[PDB]
Design a protein around this ligand. Structure first.
Ligand SMILES: Nc1ncnc2c1ncn2[C@@H]1O[C@H](COP(=O)(O)OP(=O)(O)OC[C@H]2O[C@@H](O)[C@H](O)[C@@H]2O)[C@@H](O)[C@H]1O
Lengths: 274, 11, 433
């Protein structure tokens, strides 16, 4: 069931990883012929505010770490934990090899904590009856089409320092699904955001992941049981998303990264079809 | 049509 | 004793009038690929009219390359219509592309009569430009059989049944190549033997655009140009473009995928064959709320696709299934006509539902509803718009709709536009005096 990311790192100008077979992916297996290529993206190498420093020394992993007095999730959801390389001081990705050392397209060394906000509603006909498939009720979630690789995905982004999943989830949902942001619609949206459940905290199968930087996701589901609050949303794609739309949840979806596992967790929790 | 809805779809 | 045309009226880019210029000057801009790899090419010179047995009128043909601009081909069609039926010919208000199975099919008689009635009704009521392929087998032949009666019942204007086919598969291509550019009467021999090619042209299509890429006996090279030409024509006559899928193979699926991605609606006839049935299941699985469809799964679909297209690899099957699910993603762009759920005389209503589900402004949809003579549809749309606080758009489009209802002789629609607070003395001319 092991995930192996594609050879060419996204937005790197044709820079390619070190190709490995799917039976050599896990960290328990030895694999002595592992010779990754060290590549760091120009955006990451320019040192932004949301990017960790290029020298990972003096940073403590597997616990919540404070950068500029703000706490940032530096602990991974992997059961083994994060191992620290002795030679360079960089953390080592517990979710497997990716054929690439360095931080790559990811701004934070080790676990880059991302929060995804899956806002769901039951797919209903005008008559009001809930659509039913394979003996389970069918769900429907807001998915945005990404600007960079033109694949549909769940809205979300990296968790900022000093903030929780609640703020990150709400801010990302307002930014992506709603764009610019009243009166009653704001009250319905506030009622909608007041009830969120962390359904999973898993390792992302994101192609930008490397051996020293890997994406780990927290999934928060905002479900509208009645469907009143969801119907008041004016869907309009913004920021780094081109278009956003309501998509039906099923097992044959071709979505970005390991978002099928995240939906699977949402439908498993809600006893919905998948 | 009522009979069709009532029986055929019930099995 | 048909005198050859020496000059043609090509419409200006401003869209206000036609200028007369020589035929050889206009055609110089069409290129041909004999070298499968000559990318730029040489001038074509294979254009003219074909005479088919048992057909009184002759059909024009133009062989143009794949990289050529569809606007030039659109002028060519406009210039020929302008030459034959004068400058004030009936402009199309609907472009009905028809795409499906090339290989023969045996469709139920009731289904055939319903499709035949509806397509004919739509084209005649709206002088539509029907774009299909050019081969004589399958849908194209079926569409040709439907349009033969239109060519018989009408005396003064017949809507173009344009056939766009990939060159290199056409019987008599060597005969077509040999000769001079002003080629008016050419005998087409569909029964003539030709060694590498085996597909003859359908004799019932009124025009023909042979798309060439330099390959021989390779299909699917004209699909992209066909889609581009329909979109270009659609922008030019401000008319909606509606594709209808019948049976169909893998390239029809790709054609339908291209059509949704470009915003063009699709009407898929359930019960008509294979790929159409696949699309109908997929929709019924994804958006139909009736009780009898609740036992629908992806496994039975995937098994059906596997049985119909027969892909070499599992990943190919996954890609085809993913593409099929990507086609029906938007419920507005797909309308499924089925015999057991709809009426015999309701296929044009399905075409109108596709038009109403994809036309943005209220006025264009109301004009199309007038054309098809469906007052109830127009009445329901106006009442729904009136109830939902969209009164401003009603007032903005009511004058233009009333002006068309008067021009196209529809009194019943005239009463309706007036009943919705439209003052008769507040009419405005389309142009400025
Ligand atoms: N327009 C055509 N005419 C005749 N034969 C064709 C055509 N296109 C393909 N063929 C060949 O004839 C065989 C008939 O199979 P189909 O499944 O009918 O081919 P299909 O996949 O439907 O091809 C798509 C074609 O159909 C048209 O509606 C559309 O223009 C598209 O080019 C196929 O193996 C194909 O190689």
């Amino acid at each position: 069931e092991w995930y192996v990311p594609p050879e060419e790192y996204p937005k790197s100008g044709g820079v390619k990883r070190y190709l490995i077979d799917a039976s050599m992916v896990p960290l328990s297996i030895m694999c002595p012929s592992y010779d990754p290529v060290e590549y760091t993206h120009p955006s990451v190498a320019a040192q932004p505010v949301w990017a960790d420093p290029a020298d990972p020394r003096k940073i403590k992993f597997n616990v919540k770490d404070e950068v500029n007095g703000k706490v940032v999730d530096r602990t991974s959801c992997h059961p083994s934990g994060i191992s620290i390389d002795s030679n360079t001081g960089r953390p080592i990705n517990p979710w497997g090899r990716t054929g690439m050392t360095g931080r790559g397209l990811l701004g934070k060394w080790g676990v880059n904590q991302a929060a995804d906000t899956v806002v769901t509603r039951w797919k209903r006909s005008p008559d009001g009856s809930i659509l039913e498939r394979d003996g389970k009720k069918v769900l429907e979630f807001v998915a945005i089409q990404r600007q960079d690789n033109k694949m549909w995905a769940i809205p979300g982004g990296f968790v900022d320092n000093g903030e929780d999943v609640a703020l990150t989830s709400g801010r990302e949902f307002m930014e992506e699904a709603l764009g610019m942001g009243s009166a009653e619609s704001k009250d319905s949206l506030a009622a909608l955001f007041s009830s969120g459940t962390i359904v999973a905290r898993i390792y992302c199968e994101d192609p930008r992941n490397t051996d020293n930087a890997w994406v780990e996701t927290t999934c928060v589901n905002f479900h509208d049981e009645s469907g009143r609050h969801a119907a008041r949303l004016k869907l309009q794609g913004g920021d780094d998303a081109e278009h956003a739309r309501w998509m039906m949840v099923h097992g044959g979806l071709n979505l970005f990264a390991s978002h099928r596992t995240l939906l699977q967790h949402v439908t498993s929790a809600l006893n919905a079809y998948f | 049509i009522s009979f069709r809805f009532s029986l055929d779809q019930q099995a | 004793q048909s005198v050859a045309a020496k000059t043609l009226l090509i419409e200006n880019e401003d869209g206000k009038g036609s200028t007369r210029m020589e035929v050889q000057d206009f055609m110089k801009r069409f290129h041909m690929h004999a070298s499968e790899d000559d990318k730029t090419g040489s001038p074509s010179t294979a254009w003219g009219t074909l005479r088919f047995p048992t057909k009184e009128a002759t059909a024009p043909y133009l062989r143009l390359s794949v990289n050529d601009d569809p606007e030039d081909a659109l002028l060519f069609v406009k210039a020929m219509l302008a030459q034959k039926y004068g400058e004030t010919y009936d402009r199309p208000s609907l472009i009905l592309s028809v795409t499906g199975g090339a290989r023969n099919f045996t469709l139920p008689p009731r289904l055939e009569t319903a499709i035949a009635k509806g397509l004919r009704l739509a084209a005649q009521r709206t002088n539509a430009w029907v774009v299909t392929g050019g081969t004589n087998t399958g849908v194209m032949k079926l569409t040709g059989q439907i349009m033969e009666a239109l060519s018989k019942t009408q005396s003064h204007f017949i809507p173009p049944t344009i056939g766009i086919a990939t060159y290199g598969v056409i019987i008599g291509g060597d005969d077509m190549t040999r000769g001079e550019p002003p080629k008016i009467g050419l005998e087409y021999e569909m029964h003539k033997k030709d060694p590498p090619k085996t597909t003859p042209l359908d004799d019932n299509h009124n025009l023909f655009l042979l798309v060439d890429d330099g390959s021989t006996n390779k299909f699917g090279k004209e699909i992209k140009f066909r889609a581009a030409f329909e979109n270009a024509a659609g922008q030019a006559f401000a008319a909606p473009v509606v594709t209808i899928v019948v049976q169909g193979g893998p390239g029809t699926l790709g054609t339908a995928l291209q059509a949704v991605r470009q915003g063009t609606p699709i009407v898929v006839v359930d019960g008509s064959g294979l790929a159409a049935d696949v699309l109908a299941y997929a929709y019924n699985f994804m958006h139909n709320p009736l009780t009898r469809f609740k036992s629908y799964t992806i496994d039975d679909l995937r098994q059906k696709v596997a049985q119909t297209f027969n892909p070499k690899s599992s990943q190919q099957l996954t890609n085809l299934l993913d593409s099929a699910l990507e086609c029906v993603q938007d419920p507005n762009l797909v309308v499924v006509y089925s015999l057991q759920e709809s009426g015999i005389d309701e296929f044009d209503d399905c075409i109108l539902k596709a038009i109403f589900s994809s036309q943005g402004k209220l006025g264009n949809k109301l004009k199309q509803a007038m054309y098809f003579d469906q007052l109830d549809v127009a009445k329901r749309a106006l009442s729904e718009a009136s109830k939902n606080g969209q009164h401003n758009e009603i007032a903005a489009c009511i004058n233009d709709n009333l002006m068309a209802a008067m021009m196209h002789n529809k009194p019943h629609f005239v009463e309706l536009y007036l009943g919705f607070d439209a003052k008769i003395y507040e009419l405005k001319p389309s142009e400025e005096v």
